[PDB]
Nucleic acid binder design. Structure first.
Length: 49
RNA sequence: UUGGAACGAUACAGAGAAGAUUAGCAUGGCCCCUGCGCAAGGAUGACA
């Protein structure tokens, strides 16, 4: 994740590991990348792309 | 070609959660009830 731990809060570390399991950060980034691709793919002949 | 480092580096993976999870029936315990067997035992009905 991109979460920076300011001190060893072990309970918070475990919670954030459970919340961002199965590579959720990469999946979120990829999904937003795909969404921007589609929103820019639709308007390619109007934005002169 | 030949040496550092090897409690390191990188590669993969990363849920570092929490657990002997859970549905059915039968057995077993208890109290009846019903049927049959076994061993005995009660009370009672019946003329020429």
């Amino acid at each position: 994740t991109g979460i920076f731990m300011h001190g060893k809060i072990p309970t918070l570390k475990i919670s954030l590991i459970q919340i961002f399991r199965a590579h959720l950060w990469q999946k979120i980034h990829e999904s937003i990348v795909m969404d921007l691709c589609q929103v820019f793919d639709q308007e390619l002949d109007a934005l002169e792309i």
